[PDB]
Design a protein around this motif. Structure first.
Motif, PDB file in Angstrom:
ATOM      1  N   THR A 124      18.158  90.086 -56.090  1.00 57.12           N
ATOM      2  CA  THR A 124      16.913  90.120 -56.414  1.00 57.12           C
ATOM      3  C   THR A 124      16.076  90.933 -55.740  1.00 57.12           C
ATOM      4  O   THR A 124      15.147  91.873 -56.389  1.00 57.12           O
ATOM      5  N   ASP A 151       6.142  90.332 -57.830  1.00 56.90           N
ATOM      6  CA  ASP A 151       6.568  91.008 -56.639  1.00 56.90           C
ATOM      7  C   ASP A 151       5.436  92.174 -56.226  1.00 56.90           C
ATOM      8  O   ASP A 151       4.373  91.997 -56.961  1.00 56.90           O
ATOM      9  N   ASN A 179       8.054  93.719 -61.015  1.00 60.79           N
ATOM     10  CA  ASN A 179       8.993  93.507 -60.207  1.00 60.79           C
ATOM     11  C   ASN A 179       8.616  94.735 -59.427  1.00 60.79           C
ATOM     12  O   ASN A 179       7.642  94.919 -58.793  1.00 60.79           O
ATOM     13  N   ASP A 207      15.355  94.446 -60.657  1.00 64.68           N
ATOM     14  CA  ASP A 207      14.374  93.345 -60.052  1.00 64.68           C
ATOM     15  C   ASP A 207      13.620  94.226 -58.971  1.00 64.68           C
ATOM     16  O   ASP A 207      12.622  94.937 -59.065  1.00 64.68           O
TER      17      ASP A 207
HETATM   18 MG   LIG Z   1      11.830  90.256 -58.018  1.00 65.21          MG
END
Ligand SMILES: [Mg+2]
Ligand SMILES: [Hg+2]
Ligand SMILES: [Hg+2]
Length: 307
Positions: free
Chosen positions: A254, A110, A159, A211
């Protein structure tokens, strides 16, 4: 309760991820972290497009000052893609930096610009696993002269990221830690310190793994819960406070980004990838994109990366 709408026009994604709302063009960009594709959705015109590359991708963020160009990840490289938003491949690719040239089985995950336009992003083993797997990632930002600086090591799955409106705090998720951490953020030196848990899933009986995340204008964090079939709203004013839960039909939520004309429509990505140790049968795991309205809060426009 809030209205959760499945966006029929968008179909299903293996791992839809990395949503970014460009407010000036009223356009959502996102990725699939497995299928090596970028995506664009213009809700007011019901327009959808995709773009294919041959490397794993994890974020897409417009380049400040450069219409038609985006800062993206390509495996371990941060790159600028020149993309018209509609052709099925980029026009051209300009590599900026490889963050981990000698870690052959890592990838970027991310990423997001801080409110000043600095890209922050972290890495992970391509074969990372939960609850336990290889822990090989680090957290970086991209600074001057296209060089990266490292801020944290021992990250399993790099993330979601967010920053407080006063620029004094950063919030960060390693999904393997099953918590959201807060840090003191020094906007002048672009460094973080005083890492401490803000919200710990096990203390609140929240299943799954944090997430992606985003922050609203009141300072509440909205956190995607992968294998929790939900987003959660948590306080940044007090540690360990669950403010609300919104169920999302897809179990593998997500990430999140506020959008719409008034920045009050929460876009939610999910993953259809069916994993062998799932708490949900395959019939439930689809990968749709959702839009949540009626939350009573507004977020912020997505920030462009400055180079
Ligand atoms: Mg992610
Ligand atoms: Hg593209
Ligand atoms: Hg692109």
């Amino acid at each position: 309760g809030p209205v959760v709408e499945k966006i029929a026009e968008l179909g299903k994604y293996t791992v839809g991820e990395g949503p970014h709302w460009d407010h000036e063009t009223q356009t959502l960009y996102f990725v699939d972290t497995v299928e090596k594709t970028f995506h664009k959705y213009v809700p007011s015109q019901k327009k959808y497009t995709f773009c294919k590359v041959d490397k794993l991708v994890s974020f897409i963020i417009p380049l400040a000052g450069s219409p038609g160009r985006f800062v993206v990840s390509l495996e371990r490289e941060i790159a600028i893609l020149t993309w018209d938003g509609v052709s099925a491949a980029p026009t051209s690719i300009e590599a900026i930096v490889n963050v981990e040239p000698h870690i052959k089985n890592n990838r970027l995950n991310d990423g997001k610009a801080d409110p000043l336009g600095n890209l922050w992003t972290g890495t992970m083993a391509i074969d990372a696993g939960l609850p336990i797997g290889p822990v090989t990632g680090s957290l970086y930002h991209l600074g001057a002269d296209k060089k990266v600086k490292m801020h944290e090591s021992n990250i399993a799955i790099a993330n979601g990221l967010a920053w407080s409106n006063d620029l004094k705090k950063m919030y960060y998720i390693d999904s393997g830690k099953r918590r959201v951490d807060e840090y003191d953020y020094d906007a002048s030196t672009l460094s973080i310190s005083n890492q401490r848990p803000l919200f710990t899933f096990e203390k609140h009986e929240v299943p799954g793994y944090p997430d992606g995340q985003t922050i609203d204008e009141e300072g509440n964090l909205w956190v995607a819960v992968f294998q929790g079939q939900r987003i959660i709203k948590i306080s940044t004013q007090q540690p360990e406070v669950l403010l609300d839960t919104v169920k999302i039909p897809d179990p593998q939520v997500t990430s999140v980004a506020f959008g719409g004309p008034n920045l009050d429509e929460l876009y939610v990505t999910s993953a259809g990838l069916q994993l062998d140790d799932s708490s949900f049968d395959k019939s439930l795991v689809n990968g749709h994109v959702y839009r949540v309205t009626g939350l009573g809060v507004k977020g912020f426009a997505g920030v462009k990366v400055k180079l």
